[PDB]
RNA sequence: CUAGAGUACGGUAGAGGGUGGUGGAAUUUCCUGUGUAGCGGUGAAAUGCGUAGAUAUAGGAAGGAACACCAGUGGCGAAGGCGACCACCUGGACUGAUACUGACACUGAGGUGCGAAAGCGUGGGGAGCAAACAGGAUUAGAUACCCUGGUAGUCCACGCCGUAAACGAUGUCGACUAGCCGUUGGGAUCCUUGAGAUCUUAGUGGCGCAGCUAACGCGAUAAGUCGACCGCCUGGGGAGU
């Protein structure tokens, strides 16, 4: 039920407009290499999974998160 | 191919008291001529006792283990490429490989007095200069060129 | 000449495997290939031949010392992990093992499909 | 990335960490270009093999 | 007159368009260091590339196009189509409450538009890929498959052409007809902690009863029961000539 509670990581709270600033949240959703996790592993609702993917791609642009283990 | 094959046993050598020599005697017999082949194996046994003071069973015990090989190839074809695989020779099989190599090189020795042909074969393999020992080690060299195919498409 | 704590580069294609021992500066010390060990064909692509060429690079590396190695593995082909087990067989302290793999995000288009 | 302690442990921590990350099947699909219709066949046949697997397992779940 | 249809008001979701800008990984060409005998390719080889210092490896520069993971029977668009991030203009759909107009609707011969890709015209631009072509191999033979190279093209601006297995092989619109399991988005009611509950519309999937069907099979997203208008079919070749 670990994939069930992470659906409530955004829906149980009123944190609907997520930001690209809380890196302590976003590092839970990024794998060890750098690529972004699926949504059948976290089990988050697909409204927020689309909203989660934008905050990664903006934080990646501002060099707050890497791409690969190369750089 | 249901597995069927049981085991039949031949172990009889009363005039010397041996077991390996009786199985070796069967590889010399042609068309059931047992009494002919019996006096030739003893005929090439006493010439070693004439030659060496040691008991010639142990000369025969040493001459097996310098003709008997360890690994050999096995051409198992993948069905589109002909490969060969060096395989470990089973411990039961490795006795008969030496005894069958030994007789076939005795027949092309090209001497006189037939029991002297087999006499010279058992003398060389206690040293290593026999043609059976040279045929042993050459197939050993074929495995390491084949050693790349040991597990992979094997 | 004396250098220590070198870097081992391993390049593994579908037909050949090239191993190179370098420094932190990225300078050649000893290179060794699967074709130079005398295989040249279907035997060339085997992971056994990636052990023969691996240790042979590990013998001209003791000219300069190099008691510590850092391994970068690169390529899709077989012998990708068999070459690492043939490194400390020569007696080298392997510190860390690292995948380097060129993966284009979109990239140029590859050649066409075989028939 | 795998650091190091015997050596056989760090091998199996590396053979597995590469596969659990990926970048080995993706390399194998870079050697022939698929036209986007043939990439719509993977999208078609794999969706059938997932929705039929949710129902064939229910026969085991009887 | 307000049940069709349309307007005003909140509110969400989206690779729906157009105009600029900016990224990171990878490929190639070039420069420079180290270093020295092969690399590359394949059922196996050969053509090719190499000490006139290649592959490898490190540093740097230039340039071109595509946009991993998220990504899904998932979305949007009238259809073709549409995936990096941001600004910039800009169309329509959903959902709720409430007032207004009071039938203002449907379909549509002719006519008007938007039309994948290959191709055509003038100008740019040239990373990879690659018809035509060249060489090697296979082969009785091999223009072919496989291998090494390689040009128009693919890319951009402007204009043209109008066809495709342009496919759900199913014209648009409206009304009734047992169920069950999914899923996108949106309100509800509800005990409240929910991994909640049930109901209702707008989509999108898997089974299924009546019913229909030559059979296969569809089955509230009908090929079921019925209406309104349009297009089209009449044995095979000859011939969509």
XYZ file of C-alpha atoms (C1' of nucleotides) in Angstrom:
643
model
C 0.000 0.000 0.000
C 3.076 2.174 -0.414
C 1.769 2.976 -3.888
C -1.560 3.887 -2.286
C -0.261 6.401 0.276
C 1.822 8.316 -2.266
C -1.379 9.109 -4.116
C -2.325 10.879 -0.883
C 1.051 12.637 -0.800
C -0.600 15.339 -2.934
C -4.350 14.730 -2.588
C -4.707 14.462 1.188
C -2.976 17.832 1.561
C -3.953 21.145 0.015
C -0.647 21.323 -1.853
C -2.391 21.282 -5.242
C -0.166 23.854 -6.968
C 3.210 22.223 -6.452
C 6.323 24.310 -7.024
C 9.769 23.610 -8.427
C 11.206 24.925 -5.148
C 10.574 22.120 -2.632
C 13.492 19.905 -3.585
C 12.905 17.810 -0.476
C 9.676 16.657 -2.128
C 11.033 16.191 -5.652
C 13.965 14.028 -4.613
C 11.495 11.369 -3.491
C 10.293 11.029 -7.101
C 13.623 10.776 -8.955
C 15.558 7.533 -9.371
C 19.215 7.044 -8.476
C 20.404 7.619 -12.039
C 18.368 10.737 -12.728
C 15.414 9.605 -14.781
C 11.867 10.228 -13.601
C 9.784 7.460 -12.010
C 6.586 5.974 -13.498
C 3.119 6.443 -12.021
C 2.406 2.773 -11.349
C 5.288 2.758 -8.878
C 4.356 5.817 -6.871
C 0.694 5.305 -7.643
C 0.037 9.043 -7.756
C -3.089 10.289 -9.483
C -2.532 11.212 -13.117
C -3.683 14.783 -12.588
C -0.625 15.362 -10.430
C 1.780 13.131 -12.358
C 1.459 15.497 -15.312
C 1.852 18.393 -12.910
C 4.840 16.661 -11.307
C 6.647 16.317 -14.627
C 6.671 20.055 -15.272
C 8.285 20.900 -11.936
C 11.045 18.416 -12.713
C 11.751 19.895 -16.140
C 11.895 23.429 -14.762
C 14.092 22.524 -11.796
C 16.326 20.601 -14.178
C 16.694 23.745 -16.286
C 17.895 25.854 -13.346
C 20.617 23.278 -12.494
C 18.849 22.226 -9.297
C 18.702 18.580 -10.422
C 21.072 16.700 -12.737
C 20.227 14.745 -15.862
C 22.617 11.797 -15.851
C 25.597 10.531 -13.868
C 27.911 11.972 -16.557
C 27.805 15.610 -15.506
C 14.779 -42.597 -26.578
C 13.631 -44.081 -23.299
C 16.650 -44.812 -21.144
C 17.161 -48.576 -21.187
C 20.844 -49.554 -21.106
C 21.809 -51.725 -18.139
C 25.310 -53.038 -17.408
C 26.987 -56.325 -18.338
C 30.290 -57.271 -16.733
C 33.341 -59.273 -17.805
C 36.055 -59.818 -15.158
C 38.158 -62.963 -15.559
C 41.935 -63.414 -15.639
C 42.949 -66.500 -13.628
C 46.491 -67.056 -14.902
C 47.657 -63.614 -13.782
C 45.062 -62.336 -11.334
C 43.999 -59.060 -12.962
C 40.894 -57.104 -13.965
C 42.011 -54.273 -16.257
C 43.897 -56.726 -18.460
C 40.780 -58.804 -19.160
C 38.875 -55.778 -20.452
C 41.961 -54.862 -22.477
C 42.023 -58.396 -23.885
C 38.578 -57.864 -25.419
C 39.854 -54.919 -27.461
C 42.439 -57.179 -29.119
C 40.137 -60.100 -30.025
C 38.928 -60.270 -33.628
C 35.870 -62.380 -34.533
C 35.897 -64.360 -31.296
C 39.522 -65.537 -31.601
C 40.022 -65.337 -27.862
C 42.661 -68.034 -27.351
C 44.750 -66.524 -30.145
C 44.551 -63.048 -28.627
C 45.158 -64.352 -25.098
C 48.657 -65.640 -25.867
C 49.599 -62.459 -27.731
C 48.710 -60.210 -24.791
C 50.731 -62.491 -22.535
C 53.219 -62.652 -25.408
C 53.701 -58.896 -25.188
C 53.553 -59.019 -21.383
C 56.584 -61.250 -20.787
C 58.762 -59.257 -23.187
C 58.337 -56.299 -20.821
C 59.371 -58.485 -17.880
C 62.216 -59.550 -20.159
C 62.928 -55.853 -20.745
C 62.167 -54.247 -17.371
C 62.625 -55.846 -13.959
C 59.420 -54.268 -12.633
C 56.137 -56.171 -12.717
C 54.777 -55.433 -16.211
C 51.286 -54.721 -14.892
C 52.643 -51.448 -13.503
C 54.224 -50.661 -16.864
C 50.736 -51.189 -18.280
C 49.340 -49.170 -15.350
C 51.639 -46.287 -16.268
C 51.141 -46.599 -20.029
C 47.378 -46.099 -19.740
C 47.669 -42.811 -17.874
C 49.924 -41.198 -20.483
C 47.597 -42.084 -23.373
C 44.341 -41.394 -21.521
C 43.213 -37.793 -22.227
C 41.300 -35.246 -20.137
C 39.180 -33.035 -22.426
C 38.048 -33.385 -26.019
C 35.860 -31.678 -28.594
C 32.196 -32.361 -29.380
C 30.826 -30.972 -32.651
C 27.337 -29.944 -31.545
C 25.974 -27.872 -34.422
C 23.675 -24.973 -33.589
C 21.603 -25.526 -36.728
C 23.070 -22.839 -38.946
C 26.699 -22.811 -37.831
C 29.002 -25.784 -37.278
C 30.581 -25.385 -33.839
C 32.814 -27.608 -31.729
C 32.798 -27.674 -27.921
C 35.624 -28.939 -25.660
C 33.958 -31.233 -23.142
C 35.173 -32.953 -19.989
C 35.748 -36.651 -20.633
C 33.677 -38.752 -18.240
C 35.862 -40.817 -15.846
C 34.315 -44.110 -16.955
C 34.952 -43.371 -20.637
C 38.604 -42.358 -20.347
C 39.921 -45.898 -19.860
C 38.683 -47.237 -23.189
C 39.976 -44.268 -25.187
C 43.583 -45.165 -24.418
C 43.175 -48.908 -24.935
C 41.521 -48.352 -28.308
C 44.181 -45.863 -29.410
C 46.901 -48.259 -28.282
C 45.910 -51.248 -30.405
C 45.282 -49.301 -33.613
C 48.795 -47.859 -33.537
C 50.247 -51.283 -32.788
C 48.881 -52.642 -36.065
C 50.690 -49.976 -38.108
C 53.975 -50.430 -36.203
C 55.299 -52.380 -39.177
C 57.633 -54.802 -37.404
C 57.930 -58.568 -37.495
C 56.758 -60.955 -34.745
C 53.407 -59.308 -33.859
C 53.762 -59.437 -30.063
C 56.839 -57.207 -30.477
C 54.645 -54.489 -32.026
C 52.507 -54.223 -28.896
C 55.641 -54.624 -26.765
C 57.156 -51.390 -28.073
C 53.920 -49.471 -27.540
C 53.774 -50.171 -23.804
C 57.450 -49.280 -23.401
C 57.138 -45.832 -24.976
C 54.116 -44.634 -23.002
C 55.974 -44.982 -19.709
C 58.207 -42.240 -21.182
C 56.076 -40.253 -23.646
C 57.702 -40.784 -27.070
C 54.920 -43.055 -28.319
C 52.670 -42.232 -31.237
C 49.697 -42.722 -28.928
C 51.135 -40.100 -26.584
C 51.714 -37.774 -29.543
C 48.123 -38.400 -30.662
C 46.965 -37.720 -27.092
C 48.604 -34.327 -26.713
C 47.625 -33.036 -30.155
C 43.910 -33.364 -29.383
C 44.672 -31.584 -26.098
C 45.944 -28.680 -28.187
C 42.725 -28.647 -30.231
C 40.655 -27.741 -27.164
C 42.237 -24.369 -26.378
C 41.619 -22.996 -29.851
C 38.118 -24.349 -29.224
C 38.027 -22.923 -25.692
C 36.196 -19.774 -26.805
C 33.178 -21.987 -27.565
C 33.128 -23.569 -24.108
C 29.822 -22.206 -22.788
C 28.606 -19.709 -25.376
C 26.575 -21.247 -28.183
C 27.729 -24.549 -26.704
C 58.330 6.295 -14.742
C 55.971 6.030 -11.766
C 52.230 6.692 -11.668
C 49.608 5.291 -9.294
C 45.788 5.216 -9.104
C 45.069 4.746 -12.786
C 41.820 4.448 -14.722
C 40.814 1.418 -16.800
C 38.643 2.032 -19.866
C 36.708 -0.849 -21.420
C 35.046 -0.521 -24.825
C 32.878 -3.485 -25.812
C 31.259 -3.678 -29.241
C 29.425 -6.620 -30.786
C 32.558 -7.803 -32.542
C 35.611 -6.655 -30.589
C 36.671 -5.481 -27.157
C 39.291 -2.808 -26.484
C 40.831 -2.242 -23.045
C 43.012 0.760 -22.184
C 44.846 1.651 -18.961
C 45.229 5.396 -18.412
C 45.837 8.040 -15.733
C 43.630 10.816 -14.378
C 45.047 13.043 -17.111
C 43.658 10.831 -19.864
C 46.932 9.617 -21.345
C 47.653 6.241 -22.872
C 49.784 3.761 -20.961
C 48.712 0.336 -22.224
C 46.062 -0.692 -24.737
C 45.083 -4.233 -25.657
C 42.434 -5.587 -28.011
C 40.681 -8.884 -28.580
C 41.952 -9.165 -32.132
C 45.579 -8.838 -31.078
C 45.352 -12.017 -29.016
C 44.819 -14.003 -32.220
C 41.155 -14.938 -32.513
C 39.899 -13.099 -35.644
C 36.359 -14.195 -36.352
C 33.479 -15.858 -34.554
C 35.892 -16.584 -31.713
C 36.698 -12.866 -31.548
C 33.320 -11.902 -30.088
C 33.366 -14.339 -27.184
C 33.593 -13.233 -23.537
C 36.532 -15.593 -23.121
C 38.630 -13.456 -25.465
C 37.738 -10.459 -23.305
C 39.706 -12.161 -20.529
C 42.823 -12.835 -22.597
C 43.121 -9.236 -23.742
C 42.203 -7.917 -20.296
C 45.089 -9.525 -18.435
C 47.543 -8.712 -21.233
C 46.800 -5.031 -20.718
C 47.306 -5.704 -17.008
C 50.887 -6.883 -17.511
C 52.398 -3.927 -19.349
C 50.769 -1.711 -16.705
C 53.152 -2.943 -14.001
C 55.941 -1.111 -15.817
C 54.722 2.041 -14.068
C 53.171 0.706 -10.861
C 49.414 1.448 -10.796
C 48.302 -0.388 -7.685
C 44.808 1.161 -7.874
C 42.312 1.012 -10.734
C 39.082 2.823 -11.556
C 36.898 1.027 -14.068
C 34.630 2.553 -16.709
C 32.599 -0.038 -18.617
C 31.237 1.047 -21.982
C 29.337 -0.930 -24.580
C 26.477 -3.326 -25.217
C 28.378 -6.403 -26.277
C 29.262 -9.624 -24.477
C 32.228 -9.694 -22.185
C 30.848 -6.552 -20.558
C 31.336 -7.961 -17.049
C 33.769 -10.810 -17.731
C 36.600 -8.326 -18.249
C 36.281 -6.953 -14.717
C 36.871 -10.387 -13.171
C 40.078 -10.614 -15.236
C 41.472 -7.388 -13.734
C 42.126 -8.192 -10.072
C 43.267 -11.642 -11.194
C 46.495 -9.800 -12.021
C 46.347 -8.298 -8.525
C 44.860 -4.821 -8.868
C 42.861 -3.037 -6.195
C 39.665 -2.038 -7.995
C 38.136 0.932 -6.214
C 34.833 1.575 -7.988
C 33.015 0.381 -11.095
C 31.095 2.852 -13.234
C 28.786 2.587 -16.232
C 29.430 5.072 -19.005
C 27.003 4.692 -21.864
C 26.234 7.083 -24.738
C 22.453 7.374 -24.800
C 20.994 10.086 -27.029
C 17.818 11.720 -25.821
C 16.664 11.990 -29.408
C 19.851 11.866 -31.471
C 20.436 11.205 -35.123
C 18.471 8.453 -36.732
C 20.137 5.032 -36.874
C 20.564 2.874 -39.994
C 17.736 0.829 -41.455
C 16.589 -2.618 -40.377
C 18.263 -5.721 -41.764
C 16.428 -8.358 -43.769
C 27.769 3.572 -9.987
C 29.050 0.921 -7.574
C 31.733 1.531 -4.957
C 33.496 -0.924 -2.665
C 34.616 -6.031 1.104
C 35.039 -9.096 -1.098
C 34.880 -8.727 -4.838
C 32.059 -11.122 -5.755
C 29.604 -9.019 -3.741
C 30.377 -5.815 -5.640
C 29.964 -7.628 -8.968
C 26.430 -8.756 -8.180
C 25.744 -5.313 -6.752
C 26.801 -3.987 -10.179
C 25.223 -6.480 -12.579
C 21.936 -5.890 -10.785
C 22.203 -2.120 -10.353
C 22.794 -1.694 -14.077
C 19.744 -3.801 -14.951
C 17.553 -2.193 -12.283
C 18.490 1.182 -13.749
C 18.226 0.169 -17.410
C 20.417 1.386 -20.302
C 20.910 -2.128 -21.633
C 17.632 -2.788 -23.421
C 17.577 0.821 -24.644
C 20.951 0.384 -26.361
C 19.608 -2.732 -28.079
C 16.827 -0.655 -29.698
C 19.184 1.920 -31.235
C 20.553 -0.281 -34.011
C 17.630 -0.238 -36.444
C 15.177 2.569 -37.040
C 11.512 1.707 -36.604
C 9.019 3.639 -38.657
C 6.323 5.086 -36.363
C 3.720 2.568 -37.555
C 5.922 -0.236 -36.259
C 6.191 1.695 -32.997
C 2.396 1.752 -32.957
C 2.466 -2.043 -33.062
C 4.339 -2.202 -29.759
C 1.776 0.223 -28.368
C -0.998 -2.035 -29.676
C 0.227 -5.526 -28.826
C 1.476 -4.656 -25.345
C -1.833 -3.080 -24.327
C -3.594 -6.317 -25.269
C -1.033 -8.354 -23.327
C -1.721 -6.295 -20.198
C -5.524 -6.170 -20.193
C -5.748 -9.875 -21.016
C -3.305 -10.614 -18.200
C -5.604 -8.887 -15.710
C -8.379 -11.322 -16.695
C -6.487 -14.595 -17.220
C -5.072 -14.223 -13.707
C -8.640 -14.004 -12.366
C -9.116 -17.597 -13.531
C -6.208 -18.453 -11.240
C -7.855 -16.140 -8.670
C -11.065 -18.222 -8.738
C -45.597 28.748 -24.310
C -40.308 26.753 -23.202
C -38.867 21.064 -23.387
C -35.043 22.226 -29.155
C -31.255 26.124 -30.223
C -28.340 30.375 -28.876
C -26.514 34.477 -25.301
C -24.754 36.621 -20.597
C -21.577 34.436 -15.375
C -18.276 31.643 -12.395
C -14.902 27.512 -12.986
C -11.479 23.732 -14.549
C -8.412 20.230 -18.342
C -5.482 19.839 -22.948
C 1.434 17.153 -27.845
C -5.352 22.562 -30.582
C -2.850 26.581 -33.867
C 0.847 30.762 -35.222
C 5.372 34.083 -34.182
C 10.199 34.361 -31.673
C 13.741 32.849 -27.934
C 16.883 29.124 -24.863
C 18.589 24.503 -23.375
C 21.168 19.197 -22.318
C 22.749 14.154 -24.065
C 24.491 11.901 -28.378
C 26.622 11.734 -33.797
C 30.122 13.944 -37.409
C 34.114 17.236 -39.215
C 38.584 20.056 -37.268
C 42.509 21.371 -33.835
C 46.125 19.589 -29.741
C 48.561 15.977 -26.129
C 49.583 10.951 -24.695
C 50.335 6.250 -27.116
C 51.341 2.016 -31.064
C 49.626 -2.021 -34.300
C 45.734 -3.000 -36.508
C 40.660 -1.224 -36.860
C 35.832 -2.019 -39.063
C 32.582 -5.683 -40.939
C 30.062 -10.723 -41.539
C 26.849 -17.450 -42.057
C 32.227 -16.696 -42.765
C 34.995 -13.330 -45.706
C 36.333 -9.312 -49.114
C 36.040 -4.009 -50.920
C 37.484 -0.078 -47.207
C 40.668 2.537 -43.263
C 45.912 2.302 -41.060
C 53.046 3.797 -38.609
C 52.402 9.789 -44.179
C 50.502 7.505 -36.490
C 44.380 4.859 -37.347
C 40.875 2.843 -33.496
C 41.218 4.059 -28.336
C 41.880 8.237 -24.969
C 41.828 13.526 -22.984
C 41.205 19.062 -24.106
C 38.935 22.752 -27.426
C 36.053 24.882 -31.443
C 32.175 24.971 -35.159
C 27.546 23.268 -37.076
C 22.995 20.734 -38.149
C 18.423 18.159 -37.204
C 15.646 15.503 -33.461
C 13.394 16.112 -28.259
C 15.175 9.735 -23.746
C 12.720 8.840 -18.709
C 7.538 10.946 -17.666
C 4.185 7.995 -21.700
C -0.818 5.219 -20.488
C -7.015 0.902 -24.433
C -3.980 8.778 -21.863
C -5.439 13.633 -24.085
C -6.797 17.456 -27.860
C -8.450 18.473 -33.042
C -13.876 18.736 -38.186
C -10.343 15.095 -40.686
C -4.966 14.869 -42.227
C -2.353 15.655 -37.728
C -0.233 17.192 -33.030
C 5.192 15.374 -27.585
C 12.003 19.813 -24.828
C 11.168 24.577 -21.589
C 9.310 30.099 -21.479
C 7.061 34.533 -23.271
C 3.795 36.211 -27.009
C -0.863 36.524 -29.536
C -5.385 32.929 -30.533
C -9.899 28.965 -31.559
C -13.246 25.432 -29.378
C -14.945 21.854 -25.690
C -16.394 20.563 -20.567
C -19.019 21.856 -15.392
C -22.108 24.608 -11.998
C -25.576 28.357 -10.706
C -28.802 32.001 -12.762
C -31.356 35.417 -15.871
C -32.749 36.486 -20.842
C -34.344 35.627 -26.449
C -39.055 32.270 -27.647
C -38.461 27.537 -32.561
C -34.276 31.365 -34.257
C -33.815 23.837 -36.104
C -32.025 19.664 -39.253
C -29.748 18.084 -43.895
C -27.532 19.785 -48.285
C -27.264 18.828 -55.820
C -24.439 22.452 -57.593
C -20.494 25.960 -55.352
C -16.572 27.264 -51.519
C -12.453 25.788 -48.232
C -8.662 22.909 -45.255
C -5.911 18.674 -48.095
C -0.197 12.615 -44.926
C 4.003 11.309 -47.832
C 6.530 11.181 -52.395
C 7.056 15.114 -56.199
C 7.424 20.368 -58.728
C 9.249 26.210 -58.863
C 12.723 30.478 -56.855
C 15.898 31.332 -52.746
C 18.487 29.674 -48.304
C 20.915 25.682 -45.454
C 24.092 20.467 -45.678
C 24.788 16.761 -38.912
C 23.024 11.920 -39.757
C 20.067 8.890 -42.809
C 19.576 7.507 -47.950
C 16.344 5.932 -53.894
C 19.579 6.605 -58.461
C 24.565 4.952 -58.591
C 29.799 2.468 -57.549
C 32.639 -1.651 -55.557
C 33.001 -6.341 -52.728
C 30.391 -11.039 -51.582
C 26.643 -14.712 -52.513
C 24.974 -16.860 -56.941
C 24.038 -21.850 -63.183
C 22.673 -16.489 -63.322
C 21.611 -11.952 -59.036
C 19.834 -6.124 -62.035
C 18.148 -8.396 -55.607
C 18.485 -9.564 -50.244
C 23.745 -8.964 -46.927
C 28.782 -5.435 -46.791
C 31.847 -0.683 -47.679
C 30.797 4.039 -49.917
C 27.431 7.613 -51.782
C 23.815 12.105 -54.791
C 18.584 14.253 -55.232
C 15.858 14.389 -51.115
C 14.428 14.715 -45.787
C 15.298 20.748 -42.966
C 13.402 26.550 -43.665
C 10.773 30.553 -46.238
C 7.045 31.395 -50.424
C 3.868 29.055 -54.258
C 1.907 24.517 -56.465
C -0.208 19.623 -56.920
C -4.660 17.031 -54.879
C -4.567 11.615 -54.614
C -3.626 6.857 -50.107
C -5.283 0.063 -46.901
C -7.226 9.264 -46.508
C -9.876 2.551 -42.243
C -14.155 1.982 -37.400
C -13.131 -1.240 -44.895
C -19.405 1.494 -40.917
C -22.758 9.586 -44.125
C -24.431 13.308 -40.756
C -28.693 14.274 -36.904
C -32.683 12.803 -33.149
C -35.413 9.411 -29.860
C -36.217 4.316 -26.782
C -34.000 -0.704 -25.207
C -31.056 -6.121 -19.230
C -26.340 -6.024 -16.863
C -20.933 -6.155 -14.933
C -15.673 -4.821 -14.804
C -12.129 -0.835 -16.011
C -10.265 4.653 -17.199
C -9.714 10.176 -18.360
C -12.532 15.469 -15.941
C -16.414 17.525 -13.405
C -19.767 18.223 -9.896
C -22.712 15.916 -6.231
C -24.615 13.330 -1.729
C -22.320 11.003 2.369
C -20.711 8.644 8.937
C -15.723 10.450 8.481
C -10.305 8.320 9.276
C -10.630 6.638 4.517
C -6.360 2.452 0.344
C -14.007 6.020 1.392
C -19.170 5.065 -0.319
C -23.232 5.460 -3.865
C -25.539 8.377 -7.762
C -25.259 11.651 -12.282
C -23.573 13.731 -16.839
C -19.212 14.347 -21.052
C -15.440 10.870 -23.247
C -12.589 6.258 -24.008
C -11.832 0.431 -23.324
C -13.048 -5.205 -22.064
C -17.242 -9.084 -21.573
C -22.614 -9.909 -22.165
C -29.200 -10.901 -22.541
C -32.889 -9.774 -25.921
C -32.700 -8.734 -30.786
C -30.530 -8.931 -35.848
C -27.071 -11.572 -39.209
C -25.569 -16.204 -45.093
C -22.014 -16.935 -41.306
C -18.040 -14.488 -38.707
C -19.743 -11.163 -35.421
C -21.897 -6.285 -33.408
C -24.604 -5.635 -28.966
C -26.480 2.718 -24.743
C -19.508 4.468 -28.848
C -25.561 -1.243 -32.579
C -24.732 -4.035 -37.636
C -31.257 -3.686 -32.169
C -36.441 -0.974 -32.838
C -37.787 3.748 -35.680
C -37.762 8.747 -38.114
C -35.490 13.478 -41.776
C -32.250 14.615 -45.937
C -27.963 13.156 -49.163
C -24.260 9.970 -51.764
C -23.882 5.431 -54.271
C -24.529 -0.396 -56.462
C -26.552 -3.786 -60.849
C -22.196 -10.721 -63.556
C -16.315 -11.329 -64.784
C -12.742 -9.470 -68.183
C -12.272 -5.274 -71.451
C -11.594 -0.808 -67.513
C -11.424 3.846 -63.612
C -8.870 2.335 -69.475
